[PDB]
Structures are given as C-alpha cells and as structure tokens.
Ligand binder design. Structure first.
Ligand SMILES: O=c1ccn([C@@H]2O[C@H](COP(=O)(O)O)[C@@H](O)[C@H]2O)c(=O)[nH]1
Ligand SMILES: [Cu+2]
Ligand SMILES: [Zn+2]
Ligand SMILES: [Zn+2]
Ligand SMILES: [Zn+2]
Lengths: 153, 153
C-alpha cells in the first residue's frame, strides 16, 4: 500500500489538501480531499510534469504525458497520464474530491510522486472543445493552486 | 531522474531554492542553491522521510533512514540516507549551498524525490554531541523551513 499527499497553495485564496492511496502496484489509485476558495463550477485538475515550484505553478510545465498522447478526460483512452478531469466546487467555493483512477500510479513509469498537482481557473473540456488548445490543455486556463506530490506515511 | 528541485519555505521568511543533479544512477548527487532569512551559523540540513506538509514541516516525520542506521554526518558510514550535515549562514543570513553526496539518490531505494528537505533551527552535531538524541536527530532543533523534493526538467 503506497500513499501520497499534496498540499495545494497559490498566490490567491485557493488552498487544498489531496490524498492518494494505491493498495497494489498497477492497481487503481484512490484520490480524495478538499479544495476551497475557488469559484462555483468546474476546475481543471491535472498532474503536471515537473515537481518544480521555483517560480510558482508555472514552473511545473505541461501535463504529465510520458506516453505522448493528446489531452483528454480521465475516462478516455486518449489522455495524458496526468489528466484527472475537473473538480466541482459549490456556491461556498468548496470542492470535495473523490476520484479513482487506473492510469496514474504511485510507482513505475506512470509514477506521479515528485510531480505537481494543479487546480485550474476554468473548466477542462476534456479535449472535446472546439479549438486546437483543447487537445493540449483542455482550455482550463490559469493555475490557481498547486503542490508537489509527496510520499505519505 | 537526473534533476530535482526543492523550494524551502518557513516563517521569517526563511526562503530557499535547492537544486539536485545526478549524472548517472550510480553516481553522486550534486546539491546547490541558496537559503536566506536564517541566523548566522550552522543549520542542520536533512531529507526527512515523508513528502507530507499537511500540517507544515512536522508532517514530514523523521530523517529518511531506509537502512535503519543511526544519525551521522554526511561523510560518515554510519548515517541516515537523509543526513546532509549543515549549511552555514553568514551575517546577511544567507547560506550558499554546495554539497556533493554519494548516499542520497534520485532513483532507486535511496531516492529522495517526493520526500521533504528541511533546514533546522540549530546546528546538527553529526551524532557526536553528548546525549542520546544526538544519534537520532543531531540536536538540530525545530524546522525553520521545508519543501517537497520534486522532479525537475
Ligand atoms: O469526454 C469525456 C466525458 C466524460 N469523461 C469522464 O467520464 C465521467 C463519467 O463517467 P460515467 O459515470 O458516465 O461512466 C466524467 O465524470 C468524466 O470525468 C471523460 O473522461 N471524457
Ligand atoms: Cu532534518
Ligand atoms: Zn493543467
Ligand atoms: Zn492533459
Ligand atoms: Zn539523521
């Protein structure tokens, strides 16, 4: 049983805590926690390639994409490893996260430990948008908050 | 990974940016960067086990010690993997870090990616300090600043 964790912070009000749990190597990873201080509605939620916060969330680079695929949603075959969709916030600006994903991992070449989890400004269109950027970033816009994913107890 | 990075943050502000570089998996890791806002003198400098900053630096747990050894200095055979000795701050409160270490790694069982880098209140006695805590923590005191170590470009 591998566990990981991520504290999300940015330059505004957005903060969060996200936990990861993987009972078996190459089993599914349970993702759970809470994010607050975001606008009501969908916010893109991705693992970005680099655990680099040198100059804030920008330093994290593009979506974690070891298999060189196009951008998609977590339930698409054609997706980046880091493509975890959207979290959904209520009128109180709180998003309770409960995700299970079988593409990310906490070991091996799909390993997300030491990379950056990012919550975005706008919704991720899961690559179903009507432009070029949709199959690269999902049009989710700026990075509100982020954190490096670390090994947990 | 051949490169890693860590942004250290703590009250002061204590602020730091530490870079890691490992040419080959069987080689040493070069560690360089800068830490500011600390008192003149020695500050213990360790990799802690968990990359968990849920409740701040305390959540990081003990020194990274995969081999179950006693605390030491980086030049000692008897040391924790996470034992990187001290960084030394001048009167301007800046520590310029330049270390090479043969025991930490950026892959395999001694991998420090996803763990927490911590700069301490006090000097680390490198396990030579004259009490029992010396061979566990080096008597380096409270955790001034920390960050999760991430994969870098
Ligand atoms: O183009 C899409 C549409 C939906 N989904 C995901 O599928 C989930 C719905 O799954 P189901 O309950 O319809 O099986 C959504 O929450 C969303 O994350 C995608 O990955 N890509
Ligand atoms: Cu320490
Ligand atoms: Zn993103
Ligand atoms: Zn993507
Ligand atoms: Zn130690």
């Amino acid at each position: 049983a591998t566990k990981a964790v991520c504290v999300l912070k940015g330059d505004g009000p957005v903060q969060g805590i996200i936990n990861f749990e993987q009972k078996e190597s190459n089993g599914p990873v349970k993702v759970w926690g809470s994010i607050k201080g975001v606008t009501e509605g969908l916010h893109g939620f991705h693992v970005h390639e680099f655990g680099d916060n040198t100059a804030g969330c920008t330093s994290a680079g593009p979506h974690f994409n070891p298999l060189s695929r196009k951008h998609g949603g977590p339930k698409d075959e054609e997706r980046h490893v880091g493509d975890l969709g959207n979290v959904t916030a209520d009128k109180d600006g709180v998003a309770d996260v409960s995700i299970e994903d079988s593409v990310i991992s906490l070991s091996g070449d799909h390993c997300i430990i030491g990379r950056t989890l990012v919550v975005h400004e706008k919704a991720d269109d899961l690559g179903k948008g009507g432009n070029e950027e949709s199959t690269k970033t999902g049009n989710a816009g700026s990075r509100l908050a982020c954190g490096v994913i670390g090994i947990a107890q």
